[PDB]
Amino acid sequence: GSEFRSMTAIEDILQITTDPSDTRGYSLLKSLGVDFIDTLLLYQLTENEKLDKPFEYLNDCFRRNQQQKRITKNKPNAESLHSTFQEIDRLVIGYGVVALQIENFCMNGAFINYITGIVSNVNSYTDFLSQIIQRAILEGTALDLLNAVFPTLLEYCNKHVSHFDLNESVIYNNVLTIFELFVTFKPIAEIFTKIDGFFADYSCKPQDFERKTILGPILSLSPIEAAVAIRNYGDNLLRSKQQTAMIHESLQAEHKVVIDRLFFIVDKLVRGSLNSRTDMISYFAHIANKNHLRRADHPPFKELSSNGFMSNITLLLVRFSQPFLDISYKKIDKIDANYFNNPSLFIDLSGETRLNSDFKEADAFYDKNRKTADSKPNFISDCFFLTLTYLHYGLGGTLSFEEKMGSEIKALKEEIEKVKKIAANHDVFARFITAQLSKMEKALKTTESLRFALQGFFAHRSLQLEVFDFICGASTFLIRVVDPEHEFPFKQIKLPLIPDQIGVENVDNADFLRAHAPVPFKYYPEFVVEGPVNYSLYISKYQTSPIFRNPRLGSFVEFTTMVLRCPELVSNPHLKGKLVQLLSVGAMPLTDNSPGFMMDIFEHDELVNKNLLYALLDFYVIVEKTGSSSQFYDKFNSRYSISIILEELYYKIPSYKNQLIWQSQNNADFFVRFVARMLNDLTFLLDEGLSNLAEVHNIQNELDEDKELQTRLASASRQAKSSCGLADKSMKLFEIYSKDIPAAFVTPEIVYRLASMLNYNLESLVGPKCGELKVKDPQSYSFNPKDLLKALTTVYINLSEQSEFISAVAKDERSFNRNLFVRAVDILGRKTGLASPEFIEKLLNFANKAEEQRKADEEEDLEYGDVPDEFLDPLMYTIMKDPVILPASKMNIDRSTIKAHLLSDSTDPFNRMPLKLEDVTPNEELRQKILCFKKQK
């Protein structure tokens, strides 16, 4: 009849009949109408041993029932078919839910098998699952649905695949699909973080975070995973830049999609509920808290999370932050500056060096804040600071890992070549050496493959741009934390924060500065500044650096300049050393000889151009008083950098050239402090650069204990290139500067020392000291003797019409001899870079005027020079009667003279230090000779 059309439709949907003779492969059951289909089902699922895939079945049913409809509605007869089509949907989905809720309610297979099927062809369980989910939430039970499909998805990703990575294109892509599908339902999102095993096992090792944790496997999908790296590049490491660049574009494309989907998933979880996003922060916090050694010198790699894993989480956190740090800076208040005021609840700051303070101080500062709430985890700002801690330990850890690769590869190739030369006679030894060699080759492949993979990741513009932008945004935020009246970047900031030390000549400001450092900023963890700098100096080597002409550079260049301007902000000089090195990268002229990419900001950025020059000159001096256990060559590398910036700022930006000159006239004490250090260093630089250079030969010599004999030669040549380098760059500054302000270089405290330094180096450059040196390839160590001799002589010439200077050069007994200038011309007449002969002529004029004056004094003495100089008063020039030793300068002077000087001045005539005619210790011993002389003769 028609109550038949029902029993018939139930047959073709559930594929099961009752007549032992059916013309179709329907299951026969053995042991009503539509109240009988619940019974039919419970059987197919708990009795029929022929059903190995209960779930794949329930889905095919649901799948056919939904087709019976797509054709039953296109007919006039379609009514009693609704009474049934409905009870199907009620029990197919209703059971589909028990399948994924009760471990083994089915006859064949368990959770693992069903979700394995789902993962295989996911687009076919999409509708059914969707319905199973809705069912779950409406009926209450949903956590149970999750505790069945996700811990399982984890076991599947770990044990039922060979490797869950970017190579299993279908499997990972489908596993993400079931994450999205499942998490786009908000009632799930607000509960997701409760799933068994969503957190680390409190005994779980950091390498397993991305393995035994729910979000583990998918957060790791990335192209900088060894497996992917060798599959894609280890394939042919000899391919061309074109083909290489090809696979890079490809992998980049794939990664952009995976982090976009990765974000999508965690964003839904963050929006789920305060309890969820808080849990998301805890999860990420714990991962970071236990991966600090990722940033160690020799990281225990197999005991730490993967670079892919940590790098992705960084890109993610950089996105949850993008909103607060957009160029309008309107939301910049949601980030609590006092974040570090109370003990932390997530990021573990124990053992974290702070900007300008220490443990006792930070711990104590916690107490001065007892009366405020401890647990007030503002998400917005936990996210921000977690991003910074990840920028350091995650991205920072990854970037350092690749920077060291070239040097690793060199060493490996050398090692295998050594091993390759061994001749193993005995079969067991021959088999041994081959294994040794084999393992080394495998290591090499892994590294070269990884190097390409990693290179394609930092060269992935789109992604790196999100990172630097975060940095620039974070910069602006930190400036506001320093700014007394926290209002930057709305209301500008006034530097210096505390008046500059006119009296900077005191006991290590170290303690004074720390005491006057900004109340909140001083307690901030150091990584907040190291992270941005390390990354920035790093990606700067990339053709696609995000930093290049990025419209937000100013925000960073400002923060940098501020730190370099107020010594109390960050105490670590090694750190500020990096900052000054970055600035030098943005000063270097493009090969188009056009201004560095940072030159424009240097010139027009209000904050920058007002404090840059001063900061550089003050820091040039401040690094001297430092170093920390052979962190000795930092002060010189920091100066090499400052020099570069100084040389360029002077050539290309009148604005700065003016400030220099100004500084020298309106603040000579400060400008002299600077040139004085540049002067001192120049007395020995060329000397040791020359000595380290002699060694980089005494070592290449014994090369017809090597291991350390070679690390010694590599330390020697580095100190050479570093010394000859600063030498050349410092002479250029004396040349350049003397041309416009010769007066500044003839002040009493600089002139005599300046003359002696010049004659001394001139002696080196013109004689055997440089003339016998036989270095491999000069240029490699920044050693251009002839170019340096030119900057030297040009300096003489820029000062030659300064009486005091020519006088000094003439009186320098130690190393002045006109002949030196002679052969200086003669050997400047070798390579043609001598702006001569008008130069070679200007030089000889000086060389003679000096010789003139020299003889004038040698005779002036011989004739009217009886009374030995030590018996003469320094200010009255008469013979001394009551010799007395000043104590502040050890200068001898007549009782009468100081006594008479004192009447209107209680300072020492020479070195301006207070005193009283009492502190003046008489000098009898002297007045002794002053008699047997004043009498004898």
mmCIF file of C-alpha atoms in Angstrom, residues 33-360:
data_model
loop_
_atom_site.group_PDB
_atom_site.id
_atom_site.type_symbol
_atom_site.label_atom_id
_atom_site.label_comp_id
_atom_site.label_asym_id
_atom_site.label_seq_id
_atom_site.Cartn_x
_atom_site.Cartn_y
_atom_site.Cartn_z
ATOM 1 C CA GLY A 33 6.473 -0.029 11.704
ATOM 2 C CA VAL A 34 8.639 2.999 12.476
ATOM 3 C CA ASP A 35 8.856 2.415 16.240
ATOM 4 C CA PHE A 36 10.855 -0.548 15.073
ATOM 5 C CA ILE A 37 13.720 1.472 13.516
ATOM 6 C CA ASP A 38 15.290 2.241 16.896
ATOM 7 C CA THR A 39 15.425 -1.532 17.311
ATOM 8 C CA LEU A 40 16.841 -2.026 13.808
ATOM 9 C CA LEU A 41 19.648 0.400 14.711
ATOM 10 C CA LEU A 42 20.631 -0.802 18.188
ATOM 11 C CA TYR A 43 21.145 -4.106 16.338
ATOM 12 C CA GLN A 44 23.279 -2.928 13.378
ATOM 13 C CA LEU A 45 25.454 -1.229 16.014
ATOM 14 C CA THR A 46 25.681 -3.780 18.837
ATOM 15 C CA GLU A 47 24.965 -7.122 17.096
ATOM 16 C CA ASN A 48 25.835 -7.137 13.392
ATOM 17 C CA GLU A 49 29.478 -8.317 13.416
ATOM 18 C CA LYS A 50 29.586 -7.446 9.716
ATOM 19 C CA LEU A 51 29.752 -3.713 10.533
ATOM 20 C CA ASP A 52 33.396 -2.836 11.257
ATOM 21 C CA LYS A 53 32.780 0.884 10.796
ATOM 22 C CA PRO A 54 29.703 1.757 12.940
ATOM 23 C CA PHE A 55 30.309 5.477 12.497
ATOM 24 C CA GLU A 56 31.105 5.444 8.789
ATOM 25 C CA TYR A 57 27.750 3.656 8.649
ATOM 26 C CA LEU A 58 25.664 6.051 10.769
ATOM 27 C CA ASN A 59 27.006 8.767 8.469
ATOM 28 C CA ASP A 60 26.053 6.965 5.268
ATOM 29 C CA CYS A 61 22.554 6.540 6.713
ATOM 30 C CA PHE A 62 22.254 10.189 7.653
ATOM 31 C CA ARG A 63 23.796 10.844 4.223
ATOM 32 C CA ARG A 64 21.099 8.862 2.363
ATOM 33 C CA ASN A 65 18.180 10.056 4.519
ATOM 34 C CA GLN A 66 19.228 13.573 3.422
ATOM 35 C CA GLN A 67 18.988 12.440 -0.199
ATOM 36 C CA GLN A 68 15.653 10.682 0.191
ATOM 37 C CA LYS A 69 14.442 14.149 1.145
ATOM 38 C CA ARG A 70 16.053 15.924 -1.831
ATOM 39 C CA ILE A 71 13.786 13.759 -3.983
ATOM 40 C CA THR A 72 10.748 13.074 -1.799
ATOM 41 C CA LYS A 73 9.885 16.783 -1.736
ATOM 42 C CA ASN A 74 9.999 16.906 -5.561
ATOM 43 C CA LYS A 75 6.950 14.606 -5.678
ATOM 44 C CA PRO A 76 3.185 14.859 -4.962
ATOM 45 C CA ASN A 77 3.292 11.792 -2.701
ATOM 46 C CA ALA A 78 5.418 12.843 0.248
ATOM 47 C CA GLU A 79 3.725 12.896 3.614
ATOM 48 C CA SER A 80 3.894 9.717 5.620
ATOM 49 C CA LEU A 81 7.517 9.774 4.504
ATOM 50 C CA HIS A 82 8.048 12.733 6.823
ATOM 51 C CA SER A 83 6.855 10.752 9.863
ATOM 52 C CA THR A 84 9.741 8.381 9.163
ATOM 53 C CA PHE A 85 12.423 10.591 7.553
ATOM 54 C CA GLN A 86 12.227 12.388 10.921
ATOM 55 C CA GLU A 87 12.608 9.420 13.265
ATOM 56 C CA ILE A 88 15.663 8.531 11.165
ATOM 57 C CA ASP A 89 17.314 11.918 11.729
ATOM 58 C CA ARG A 90 16.450 11.573 15.412
ATOM 59 C CA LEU A 91 18.194 8.252 15.874
ATOM 60 C CA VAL A 92 21.007 8.468 13.333
ATOM 61 C CA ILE A 93 22.350 11.705 14.882
ATOM 62 C CA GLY A 94 21.121 10.672 18.319
ATOM 63 C CA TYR A 95 23.298 7.554 18.029
ATOM 64 C CA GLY A 96 26.085 9.305 16.173
ATOM 65 C CA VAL A 97 26.472 11.128 19.503
ATOM 66 C CA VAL A 98 26.743 8.004 21.647
ATOM 67 C CA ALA A 99 29.364 6.720 19.220
ATOM 68 C CA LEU A 100 31.564 9.666 20.191
ATOM 69 C CA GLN A 101 30.733 9.657 23.921
ATOM 70 C CA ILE A 102 30.781 6.125 25.334
ATOM 71 C CA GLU A 103 34.107 4.364 24.797
ATOM 72 C CA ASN A 104 33.023 1.040 23.317
ATOM 73 C CA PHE A 105 29.293 1.067 22.970
ATOM 74 C CA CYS A 106 29.749 -0.288 19.450
ATOM 75 C CA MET A 107 30.585 -3.828 18.405
ATOM 76 C CA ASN A 108 33.561 -2.994 16.211
ATOM 77 C CA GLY A 109 36.093 -0.192 16.614
ATOM 78 C CA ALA A 110 36.581 2.569 19.185
ATOM 79 C CA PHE A 111 37.043 6.334 19.183
ATOM 80 C CA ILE A 112 40.388 6.120 17.385
ATOM 81 C CA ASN A 113 38.908 4.181 14.481
ATOM 82 C CA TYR A 114 35.911 6.452 13.963
ATOM 83 C CA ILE A 115 37.839 9.722 14.068
ATOM 84 C CA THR A 116 40.486 8.090 11.880
ATOM 85 C CA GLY A 117 37.774 7.599 9.292
ATOM 86 C CA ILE A 118 36.529 11.128 9.797
ATOM 87 C CA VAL A 119 40.030 12.511 9.300
ATOM 88 C CA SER A 120 40.465 10.558 6.068
ATOM 89 C CA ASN A 121 37.551 12.006 4.159
ATOM 90 C CA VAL A 122 36.399 14.842 6.365
ATOM 91 C CA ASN A 123 34.183 16.652 3.879
ATOM 92 C CA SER A 124 31.792 13.687 4.130
ATOM 93 C CA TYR A 125 31.125 13.747 7.874
ATOM 94 C CA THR A 126 30.850 17.513 7.914
ATOM 95 C CA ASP A 127 27.003 17.741 7.853
ATOM 96 C CA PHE A 128 26.417 14.776 10.133
ATOM 97 C CA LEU A 129 29.028 15.861 12.715
ATOM 98 C CA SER A 130 27.722 19.422 12.665
ATOM 99 C CA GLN A 131 24.348 17.966 13.679
ATOM 100 C CA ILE A 132 25.944 15.688 16.262
ATOM 101 C CA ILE A 133 27.513 18.750 17.870
ATOM 102 C CA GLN A 134 24.246 20.774 18.056
ATOM 103 C CA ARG A 135 22.659 17.701 19.526
ATOM 104 C CA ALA A 136 25.397 17.521 22.124
ATOM 105 C CA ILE A 137 25.107 21.115 23.331
ATOM 106 C CA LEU A 138 21.279 21.200 23.414
ATOM 107 C CA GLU A 139 21.230 17.955 25.390
ATOM 108 C CA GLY A 140 23.827 19.441 27.723
ATOM 109 C CA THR A 141 26.521 16.817 27.244
ATOM 110 C CA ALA A 142 29.198 18.410 25.064
ATOM 111 C CA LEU A 143 32.344 18.273 27.164
ATOM 112 C CA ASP A 144 31.972 14.528 26.756
ATOM 113 C CA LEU A 145 31.726 14.897 22.971
ATOM 114 C CA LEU A 146 34.990 16.880 23.087
ATOM 115 C CA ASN A 147 36.805 14.550 25.524
ATOM 116 C CA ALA A 148 36.170 11.839 22.946
ATOM 117 C CA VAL A 149 37.128 13.458 19.673
ATOM 118 C CA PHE A 150 40.050 15.656 20.745
ATOM 119 C CA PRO A 151 42.272 13.645 23.063
ATOM 120 C CA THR A 152 41.795 11.084 20.290
ATOM 121 C CA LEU A 153 42.672 13.540 17.516
ATOM 122 C CA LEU A 154 45.868 13.874 19.580
ATOM 123 C CA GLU A 155 46.536 10.148 19.730
ATOM 124 C CA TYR A 156 45.824 10.016 15.988
ATOM 125 C CA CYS A 157 48.229 12.847 15.239
ATOM 126 C CA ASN A 158 50.945 11.188 17.328
ATOM 127 C CA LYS A 159 50.609 7.434 16.814
ATOM 128 C CA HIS A 160 48.536 6.912 13.656
ATOM 129 C CA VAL A 161 50.541 9.074 11.270
ATOM 130 C CA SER A 162 54.245 8.826 10.528
ATOM 131 C CA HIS A 163 54.844 12.537 11.202
ATOM 132 C CA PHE A 164 52.192 15.215 11.685
ATOM 133 C CA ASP A 165 53.715 17.998 9.607
ATOM 134 C CA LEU A 166 53.390 20.196 6.549
ATOM 135 C CA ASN A 167 54.088 17.148 4.360
ATOM 136 C CA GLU A 168 50.856 15.331 5.169
ATOM 137 C CA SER A 169 48.997 17.977 3.174
ATOM 138 C CA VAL A 170 45.671 16.170 3.262
ATOM 139 C CA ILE A 171 45.804 14.960 6.887
ATOM 140 C CA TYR A 172 46.850 18.223 8.562
ATOM 141 C CA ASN A 173 44.568 20.240 6.301
ATOM 142 C CA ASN A 174 41.691 17.964 7.307
ATOM 143 C CA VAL A 175 42.615 17.914 10.976
ATOM 144 C CA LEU A 176 42.430 21.714 10.969
ATOM 145 C CA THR A 177 39.042 21.512 9.254
ATOM 146 C CA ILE A 178 37.657 19.446 12.137
ATOM 147 C CA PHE A 179 39.082 22.035 14.587
ATOM 148 C CA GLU A 180 37.403 24.951 12.827
ATOM 149 C CA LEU A 181 34.098 23.131 12.210
ATOM 150 C CA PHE A 182 34.055 22.083 15.866
ATOM 151 C CA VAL A 183 35.156 25.413 17.320
ATOM 152 C CA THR A 184 32.999 27.782 15.213
ATOM 153 C CA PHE A 185 30.201 26.766 17.617
ATOM 154 C CA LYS A 186 30.515 29.263 20.437
ATOM 155 C CA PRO A 187 29.077 27.020 23.178
ATOM 156 C CA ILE A 188 32.115 24.811 22.481
ATOM 157 C CA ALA A 189 34.652 27.621 22.456
ATOM 158 C CA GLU A 190 33.691 28.743 25.965
ATOM 159 C CA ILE A 191 34.432 25.221 27.172
ATOM 160 C CA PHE A 192 37.231 24.013 24.911
ATOM 161 C CA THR A 193 40.031 24.670 27.414
ATOM 162 C CA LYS A 194 38.464 22.121 29.765
ATOM 163 C CA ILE A 195 39.158 19.168 27.460
ATOM 164 C CA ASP A 196 41.220 16.488 29.191
ATOM 165 C CA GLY A 197 44.887 17.174 28.482
ATOM 166 C CA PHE A 198 44.524 20.685 27.141
ATOM 167 C CA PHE A 199 47.286 21.665 29.574
ATOM 168 C CA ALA A 200 50.792 20.325 30.186
ATOM 169 C CA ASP A 201 51.138 17.324 32.494
ATOM 170 C CA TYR A 202 53.233 19.109 35.183
ATOM 171 C CA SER A 203 55.824 16.423 34.457
ATOM 172 C CA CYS A 204 55.636 16.897 30.719
ATOM 173 C CA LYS A 205 59.008 17.799 29.250
ATOM 174 C CA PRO A 206 59.198 20.949 27.043
ATOM 175 C CA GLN A 207 59.871 18.917 23.882
ATOM 176 C CA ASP A 208 56.512 17.237 24.420
ATOM 177 C CA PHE A 209 54.369 20.349 24.885
ATOM 178 C CA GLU A 210 53.623 20.269 21.165
ATOM 179 C CA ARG A 211 52.956 16.541 21.387
ATOM 180 C CA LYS A 212 50.954 15.692 24.511
ATOM 181 C CA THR A 213 48.841 18.844 24.610
ATOM 182 C CA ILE A 214 45.564 19.368 22.690
ATOM 183 C CA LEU A 215 46.555 22.379 20.572
ATOM 184 C CA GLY A 216 49.981 20.783 20.356
ATOM 185 C CA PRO A 217 50.144 19.155 16.905
ATOM 186 C CA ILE A 218 48.422 21.908 14.921
ATOM 187 C CA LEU A 219 50.361 24.774 16.522
ATOM 188 C CA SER A 220 53.454 23.034 15.112
ATOM 189 C CA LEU A 221 52.460 22.912 11.416
ATOM 190 C CA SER A 222 55.277 24.887 9.770
ATOM 191 C CA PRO A 223 57.923 24.918 7.026
ATOM 192 C CA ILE A 224 60.851 25.244 9.447
ATOM 193 C CA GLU A 225 60.420 21.644 10.670
ATOM 194 C CA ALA A 226 63.363 19.438 9.696
ATOM 195 C CA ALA A 227 61.144 16.873 7.953
ATOM 196 C CA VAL A 228 59.645 19.529 5.706
ATOM 197 C CA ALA A 229 62.963 21.256 5.161
ATOM 198 C CA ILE A 230 64.749 18.243 3.694
ATOM 199 C CA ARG A 231 61.694 17.099 1.712
ATOM 200 C CA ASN A 232 61.461 20.482 0.029
ATOM 201 C CA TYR A 233 65.096 21.656 -0.150
ATOM 202 C CA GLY A 234 67.336 18.717 0.809
ATOM 203 C CA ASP A 235 65.845 17.466 -2.395
ATOM 204 C CA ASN A 236 68.544 19.347 -4.384
ATOM 205 C CA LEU A 237 70.673 21.765 -2.343
ATOM 206 C CA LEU A 238 72.528 22.757 -5.489
ATOM 207 C CA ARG A 239 69.567 24.291 -7.300
ATOM 208 C CA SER A 240 69.597 27.862 -8.643
ATOM 209 C CA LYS A 241 68.415 30.998 -6.853
ATOM 210 C CA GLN A 242 65.400 30.987 -9.194
ATOM 211 C CA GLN A 243 64.289 27.445 -8.429
ATOM 212 C CA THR A 244 65.239 27.948 -4.753
ATOM 213 C CA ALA A 245 63.220 31.160 -4.607
ATOM 214 C CA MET A 246 60.387 29.189 -6.183
ATOM 215 C CA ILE A 247 59.973 26.629 -3.415
ATOM 216 C CA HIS A 248 60.317 29.506 -0.968
ATOM 217 C CA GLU A 249 57.279 31.283 -2.441
ATOM 218 C CA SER A 250 55.425 28.003 -2.337
ATOM 219 C CA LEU A 251 56.169 27.181 1.317
ATOM 220 C CA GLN A 252 55.483 30.784 2.289
ATOM 221 C CA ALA A 253 52.037 30.585 0.679
ATOM 222 C CA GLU A 254 51.245 27.393 2.539
ATOM 223 C CA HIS A 255 52.468 28.828 5.869
ATOM 224 C CA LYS A 256 50.478 32.055 5.495
ATOM 225 C CA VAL A 257 47.332 29.956 5.209
ATOM 226 C CA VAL A 258 48.163 27.720 8.167
ATOM 227 C CA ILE A 259 48.834 30.568 10.598
ATOM 228 C CA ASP A 260 45.711 32.368 9.312
ATOM 229 C CA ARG A 261 43.701 29.225 10.104
ATOM 230 C CA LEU A 262 45.715 28.729 13.249
ATOM 231 C CA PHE A 263 44.749 32.263 14.333
ATOM 232 C CA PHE A 264 41.100 31.710 13.408
ATOM 233 C CA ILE A 265 41.009 28.764 15.762
ATOM 234 C CA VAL A 266 42.637 30.394 18.783
ATOM 235 C CA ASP A 267 40.710 33.629 18.280
ATOM 236 C CA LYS A 268 37.416 31.724 18.630
ATOM 237 C CA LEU A 269 38.768 30.264 21.883
ATOM 238 C CA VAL A 270 39.846 33.672 23.166
ATOM 239 C CA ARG A 271 36.398 35.122 22.428
ATOM 240 C CA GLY A 272 34.695 32.136 24.042
ATOM 241 C CA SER A 273 34.844 33.529 27.568
ATOM 242 C CA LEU A 274 36.990 35.224 30.172
ATOM 243 C CA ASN A 275 37.663 31.806 31.642
ATOM 244 C CA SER A 276 38.845 30.547 28.263
ATOM 245 C CA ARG A 277 41.200 33.322 27.134
ATOM 246 C CA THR A 278 42.648 33.345 30.640
ATOM 247 C CA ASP A 279 43.385 29.650 30.130
ATOM 248 C CA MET A 280 44.879 30.395 26.723
ATOM 249 C CA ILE A 281 47.305 32.818 28.396
ATOM 250 C CA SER A 282 48.237 30.237 31.062
ATOM 251 C CA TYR A 283 48.927 27.672 28.353
ATOM 252 C CA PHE A 284 51.241 29.994 26.428
ATOM 253 C CA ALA A 285 52.830 31.320 29.612
ATOM 254 C CA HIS A 286 53.824 27.825 30.766
ATOM 255 C CA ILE A 287 55.314 26.958 27.361
ATOM 256 C CA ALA A 288 57.496 30.081 27.483
ATOM 257 C CA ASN A 289 58.350 29.742 31.186
ATOM 258 C CA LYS A 290 60.005 26.406 30.499
ATOM 259 C CA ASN A 291 61.799 27.211 27.241
ATOM 260 C CA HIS A 292 64.280 29.802 28.411
ATOM 261 C CA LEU A 293 67.328 27.749 27.432
ATOM 262 C CA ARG A 294 66.125 28.183 23.849
ATOM 263 C CA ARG A 295 68.053 31.408 24.086
ATOM 264 C CA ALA A 296 71.167 29.874 25.694
ATOM 265 C CA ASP A 297 74.587 29.754 24.004
ATOM 266 C CA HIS A 298 74.466 26.020 23.439
ATOM 267 C CA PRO A 299 70.755 25.137 23.749
ATOM 268 C CA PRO A 300 69.767 21.606 24.877
ATOM 269 C CA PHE A 301 67.711 21.355 21.693
ATOM 270 C CA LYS A 302 66.146 17.942 22.231
ATOM 271 C CA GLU A 303 64.887 19.256 25.605
ATOM 272 C CA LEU A 304 63.148 22.292 24.148
ATOM 273 C CA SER A 305 60.110 23.128 22.011
ATOM 274 C CA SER A 306 60.610 23.307 18.216
ATOM 275 C CA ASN A 307 61.392 26.524 16.364
ATOM 276 C CA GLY A 308 58.302 25.948 14.247
ATOM 277 C CA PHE A 309 56.110 25.638 17.355
ATOM 278 C CA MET A 310 57.541 28.652 19.175
ATOM 279 C CA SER A 311 57.676 30.733 16.020
ATOM 280 C CA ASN A 312 53.999 30.153 15.244
ATOM 281 C CA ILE A 313 52.834 31.036 18.718
ATOM 282 C CA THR A 314 54.819 34.258 18.308
ATOM 283 C CA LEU A 315 53.070 35.210 15.027
ATOM 284 C CA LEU A 316 49.791 34.412 16.757
ATOM 285 C CA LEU A 317 50.429 36.607 19.809
ATOM 286 C CA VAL A 318 51.674 39.325 17.431
ATOM 287 C CA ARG A 319 48.185 39.278 15.914
ATOM 288 C CA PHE A 320 46.227 39.419 19.122
ATOM 289 C CA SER A 321 48.274 42.538 19.784
ATOM 290 C CA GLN A 322 48.023 44.252 16.386
ATOM 291 C CA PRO A 323 44.696 45.934 17.477
ATOM 292 C CA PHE A 324 46.109 47.885 20.453
ATOM 293 C CA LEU A 325 49.218 49.096 18.660
ATOM 294 C CA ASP A 326 47.777 50.459 15.402
ATOM 295 C CA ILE A 327 49.043 53.911 14.351
ATOM 296 C CA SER A 328 46.151 55.785 16.043
ATOM 297 C CA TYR A 329 47.457 54.516 19.394
ATOM 298 C CA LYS A 330 43.984 55.130 20.802
ATOM 299 C CA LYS A 331 43.767 51.785 22.625
ATOM 300 C CA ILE A 332 47.302 52.095 24.043
ATOM 301 C CA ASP A 333 45.810 52.574 27.520
ATOM 302 C CA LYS A 334 44.533 49.022 27.796
ATOM 303 C CA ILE A 335 48.130 47.959 28.415
ATOM 304 C CA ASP A 336 48.834 48.415 32.131
ATOM 305 C CA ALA A 337 52.247 50.052 32.576
ATOM 306 C CA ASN A 338 52.300 48.920 36.201
ATOM 307 C CA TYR A 339 51.972 45.331 34.971
ATOM 308 C CA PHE A 340 55.200 44.478 36.846
ATOM 309 C CA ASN A 341 54.219 46.335 40.022
ATOM 310 C CA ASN A 342 52.839 43.221 41.724
ATOM 311 C CA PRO A 343 54.075 39.614 41.673
ATOM 312 C CA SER A 344 53.322 38.120 38.235
ATOM 313 C CA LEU A 345 50.568 35.556 37.767
ATOM 314 C CA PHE A 346 51.729 34.098 34.458
ATOM 315 C CA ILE A 347 55.116 35.049 33.036
ATOM 316 C CA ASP A 348 57.749 33.793 35.517
ATOM 317 C CA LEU A 349 60.172 36.658 36.088
ATOM 318 C CA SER A 350 62.413 34.851 38.553
ATOM 319 C CA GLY A 351 66.008 35.068 37.363
ATOM 320 C CA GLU A 352 65.116 37.779 34.841
ATOM 321 C CA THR A 353 67.641 40.598 34.741
ATOM 322 C CA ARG A 354 65.790 43.912 34.898
ATOM 323 C CA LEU A 355 66.452 47.126 32.935
ATOM 324 C CA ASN A 356 67.935 49.103 35.793
ATOM 325 C CA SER A 357 67.357 47.376 39.117
ATOM 326 C CA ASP A 358 67.895 44.058 40.825
ATOM 327 C CA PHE A 359 66.153 41.256 42.681
ATOM 328 C CA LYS A 360 66.248 42.834 46.121
#
